Design a protein around this ligand. Structure first.
Ligand code: FMN
Ligand code: SF4
Ligand code: FES
Lengths: 87, 430, 213
């Protein structure tokens, strides 16, 4: 439930091939950017960093949980369906 | 004013058939003044009825002691389309308390009239009486009285000729001390597990079936008709101020004659035990400790019991509470640690399990207390037990968690030397 | 006292159960005590009725109550396991319940418990080989001033001594119904050896009534 890993913007790159090492079966890669992750305070900062480095980018809007109406008393409604059958 | 309290007269006693020596059916109840001018009371109006109760100074007899007049007036408001109900708490579960049993089986018509008079004050259409399932015979007595009242026009359509419609329903419990808690009682009537609700909402807004509700103790409701007939001022002439009226007392444990008796509020605890119960077994000096208001209240040692009065404010000063006014007496032959450990074992068996501090905490306290009984512990654990109880108290949904912490705190407060001495004995055998 | 169910030849969803035609009339009156749209309020009394007819609650009985009231079976299971008066295993024809909470403990309820075990030859929680008696300990039964007391089926036997309870068991073995209430001198909750109150004649109607009615 914690939300502390949803505060900052991140930049990541496309995933490329990983293959099995013939000797040990380990996951080999030839992609030098496979583990590169950058943290930014705002979308604008991340976009500016991508442009000056020449990377084409896809920005995705921040998804914020919608505010909800919570009511403990609705659990015992006289005539509504929100009445719970157990606690 | 009155400086000394007690020595109540039979003319001022309310529950005049406490011992069932007279007829409990309508014929007897009517001869004793019940159902008299009930029409006059009903036509006087809810606000007048609430005035008589507010002026009487009546406080809840269920164990929390909230002022009844103020509490009952939360229902005094316009209907919004929902029915309104009065719930009478006849679960009588607190160990040591058996006062409500005598009203139900010997004075049922005071309860039935109390429901009508109290129900009118709140504008309720019906009363549900929740009576613990174990009281099978008492509940059957109550149904006979209700049928008599229905057949005599006293309740039902146009009750007492007042033009007010009232029904009295009796619903039985199935074995659960927690179902005496006001919201757990409501959840039980609705057919669920007896698990208390959080507050808000309060029952006066969302109660049984989601409708406005007031939960009142059997004794609180049963005395209400007489307070209106004889007046609130007459009721307030008893007991210390803010501690008004006559209270039913259960004296059990190590007394010569355990009994139930009606006595004035603020009576000294010593006078109550000796005047009515025949004194402590082995004499007063054989007293070790008393639990004044049922198992939920902390014990007090003999030194406090010497001068303490029996009312809400007097016993709060002695670091306890009036509770249900059920006096459990323990003489010096008692294994005090064991006696309190059996009470924690009771709360362990009665916890509903809903909320963490009681579900886990009370069971934790039981395991520690069992070890304290044998002394198989270290003195440093006494302060751990004190701290654990303080994490249960005031963090639970309902007051059962508080009622399990208090007996532990009372034992540690007044009998710490006994606990440590027992631990020393155990260690020297090992 | 397991709070899970495992199907058994004598206790499985196919175990025969059904209310009698007479009990369906009682069930109908129970359901009318509650507002329309809240038939679930009848679960506790209808479940208890099934136990009175049958003596205990097979899972089939719980499934029947759920079906009659249009209630999910799990919600009936929750109630059957929450409340201790419901018997989810068959009990003896006489279910002896000894209160052992502190107020009854202080008046020597252990001697009562010891006597019943010696006379019946069982330990707490067991049934006699003839399935006549089941013995358990219980919490306060709300008869504390009358301790030590027991409850057998729907009756309270109070102010007991080891001799008194051994008599009651002997009466139940022979089939007689023993009168409930204190087995000592007194009748109910009065002080033993004489009333210390309520010795005057009760006042009549209209006594002390405030002016203005
Ligand atoms: C665990 C627990 C058990 C209770 N049992 C009872 C009871 O048996 N009878 C009762 O009147 N109140 C009982 N109460 C108190 C009720 O919750 C409530 O305060 C009372 O019914 C209000 O009625 P009153 O205003 O007349 O005191 C209990 C409370 C708790 C926390
Ligand atoms: S304090 Fe205990 S009885 Fe009360 S709601 Fe929490 S778990 Fe249930
Ligand atoms: S302690 Fe046994 S009836 Fe209350």
């Amino acid at each position: 439930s914690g939300v502390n890993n949803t505060k900052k913007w991140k930049m990541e790159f496309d995933t490329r091939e990983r293959w099995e090492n013939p000797l040990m079966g380990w996951a080999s890669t030839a992609d030098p950017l496979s583990n590169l992750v950058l943290t930014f305070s705002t979308k604008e900062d991340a976009v500016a960093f991508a442009e000056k480095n020449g990377w084409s980018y896809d920005v995705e809007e921040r998804k914020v949980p919608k505010p909800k109406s919570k009511s403990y008393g609705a659990n015992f409604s006289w005539n509504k369906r929100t009445r719970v059958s157990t606690k | 004013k009155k400086t000394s309290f007690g020595s109540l007269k039979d003319e001022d006693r309310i529950f005049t058939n406490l011992y069932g020596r007279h007829d409990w059916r309508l014929k007897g109840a009517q001869s004793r003044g019940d159902w008299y001018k009930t029409k006059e009371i009903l036509l006087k109006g809810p606000d007048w009825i609430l005035g008589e109760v507010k002026t009487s100074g009546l406080r809840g007899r269920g164990g929390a002691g909230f002022p009844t007049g103020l509490k009952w007036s939360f229902m005094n408001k316009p209907s919004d389309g929902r029915p309104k109900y009065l719930v009478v708490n006849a679960d009588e579960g607190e160990p040591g308390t058996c006062k409500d049993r005598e009203i139900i089986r010997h004075d049922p018509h005071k309860l039935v009239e109390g429901c009508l008079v109290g129900g009118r004050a709140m504008g309720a259409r019906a009363a549900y009486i929740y009576i613990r399932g174990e009281f099978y015979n008492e509940a059957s007595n109550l149904q006979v009285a209700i049928r008599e009242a229905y057949e005599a026009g006293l309740i039902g359509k146009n009750a007492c000729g007042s033009g007010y419609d009232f029904d009295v329903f009796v619903v039985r419990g199935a074995g659960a001390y927690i179902c005496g808690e006001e919201t757990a009682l409501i959840e039980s009537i609705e057919g669920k597990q007896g698990k208390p609700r959080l507050k808000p909402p309060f029952p006066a807004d969302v109660g049984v079936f989601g409708c406005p509700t007031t939960v009142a103790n059997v004794e609180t409701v049963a005395v209400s008709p007489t307070i209106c007939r004889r007046g609130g001022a007459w009721f307030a002439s008893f007991g210390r101020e803010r501690n008004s009226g006559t209270k039913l007392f259960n004296i059990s444990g190590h007394v010569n004659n355990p009994c139930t008796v009606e006595e004035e509020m603020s009576v000294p605890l010593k006078e109550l035990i000796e005047k009515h119960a025949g004194g402590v077994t082995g004499g007063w000096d054989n007293l070790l400790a008393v639990i004044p208001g049922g198992s939920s209240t902390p014990l007090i040692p003999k030194s406090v019991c010497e001068t303490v009065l029996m009312d809400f404010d007097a016993l709060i000063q002695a670091q306890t509470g009036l509770g249900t006014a059920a006096v459990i007496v323990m003489d010096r032959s008692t294994d005090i640690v064991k006696a309190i450990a059996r009470l924690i074992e009771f709360y362990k068996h009665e916890s509903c399990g809903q909320c963490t501090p009681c579900r886990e905490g009370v069971d934790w306290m039981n395991k520690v207390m069992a070890r304290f009984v044998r002394g198989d512990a270290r003195p440093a654990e006494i302060d751990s037990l004190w701290e654990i109880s303080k994490q249960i108290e005031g963090h639970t949904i309902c007051a059962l968690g508080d009622g399990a912490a208090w007996p532990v705190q009372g034992l540690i407060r007044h009998f710490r030397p006994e606990l440590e001495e027992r631990m020393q004995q155990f260690a020297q055998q090992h | 006292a397991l709070f899970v169910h495992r199907d058994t030849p004598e206790n499985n969803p196919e175990t025969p159960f059904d209310f009698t035609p007479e009990n369906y009339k009682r069930i109908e009156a129970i359901v009318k005590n509650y507002p329309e749209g809240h038939k679930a309020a009848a679960v506790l009394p209808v479940l208890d009725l099934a136990q009175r007819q049958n003596g205990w609650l097979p899972i089939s009985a719980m499934n029947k109550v759920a079906e009659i009231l249009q209630v999910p079976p799990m919600r009936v299971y929750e109630v059957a396991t929450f409340y201790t008066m419901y018997n989810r295993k068959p009990v003896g024809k006489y279910h002896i319940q000894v209160c052992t909470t502190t107020p009854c403990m202080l008046r020597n309820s252990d001697s009562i418990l010891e006597a019943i075990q010696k006379k019946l030859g069982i330990k707490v929680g067991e049934t006699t080989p003839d399935k006549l008696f089941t013995l358990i300990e219980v919490e306060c039964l709300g008869a504390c001033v009358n301790a030590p007391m027991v409850q057998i089926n729907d009756n309270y036997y109070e102010d007991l001594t080891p001799k008194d309870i051994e008599e009651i068991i002997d009466e139940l073995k022979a089939g007689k119904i023993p009168k409930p209430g204190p087995r000592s001198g007194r009748f109910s909750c009065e002080p033993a050896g004489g009333l210390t109150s309520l010795t005057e004649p009760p006042k009549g109607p209209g006594f002390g009534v405030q002016a203005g009615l």
